[PDB]
Structure 1
C-alpha cells in the first residue's frame, strides 16, 4: 500500500503488507523481454553477494566434473530445491561432490614407473608418460592433400 515502487534506501522498517503487496493495473505491451526484466545495468541485475568461499568453489568444481550442481538462485520458487543441468546423473551418482570418495573407481590408465633416481637417463618420477597414446600424430593419407589444397588456394589470393 503506502510505499512507492520507485523507492531506494528506505529509512524506516516497512511491514510486509505495506511493501510486498501488488502493483495494480494492466501491463503495457510496449516493452520487450530485456525492457521488462528488473535490470540495474544494460543486460541485467548485478548485486554484491558474500557467499562462503568453500561452498562456491565446491559446487563450481562439481559441475565441471559431472554436469550437475545445486541451484544457486535465491528466489525462483521458495518451495523445493533442485539440481540443474544433466539432472539424471545427480540421482544416479547419489549427489556426491569432487571432495569425496568417488563411487566409480575403474579403468585407470597405465604408465611407467622407475622411482629410484640412480640410473641416469632412466628416471621418470611424476613425468611418466601413459603407455598407449603416443606422440607425432597426423590425421590422414588424404586429408593432408585437402589441407594442401586449402593452403594453395590461400596462395592464389595474395
Structure 2
C-alpha cells in the first residue's frame, strides 16, 4: 500500500508507458478525422477488456450516424450555405 496511482501503474517515464506503434497511416488518420469531425472513433487500446470492439467518444452520435468515417459518403445532406459565384475569369474586378 506504499505506492500511488502513478507508482503502481506500469510506467516507463514519469507519466506512463510509451512504446512505438506501427499503425497503418490511412486507418490512423481515418479514426483521427472521425473523432475530429463527429466526436467518436474506435478504440486503439490493445487490451482494455479483451472483448470485441467498443467506440470511444460521443458514442450516442456514433449509432445515430451508423459509425461512418470522413472518407465515406455521408447520411445527412441538407442546409447548405449559400455563396456568390463568378466562375468565368472574364470580368475584371468581379471574379471570385
Q: Same fold (TM over 0.5)?
A: yes
**Aligned partners of 1:84 and 1:36: how far apart in 2?**
25
Shift, 1:85, TM fit: 1.2
Deviating above 6 A after TM superposition, structure 1's stretches of 4 or more consecutive aligned residues are none
Q: Which has the larger radius of gyration?
A: 1
* Unpaired runs of at least 5, structure 2: none
Aligned residues between the structures:
95
> How many Å separate the matches in 2 of 1:46 and 1:115?
51
Deviation at 1:90, TM superposition (A): 0.8
| Residue among 55, 70, 75 paired with 1:98 | 70
Q: Distance in 1 between matches of 2:56 and 2:49?
A: 14
Tell me the SS of whatever aligns to 1:47.
Answer: strand
3-state DSSP class of the match of 2:41?
strand
Give how far 1:115 is off: 1.0
Shift in Å, 1:36: 0.2
The answer on 1:111 being equivalent to 2:90 is no
Q: Gaps spanning 5+ residues in structure 1: where? A: 1-28, 124-158
TM-score (norm 1): 0.59
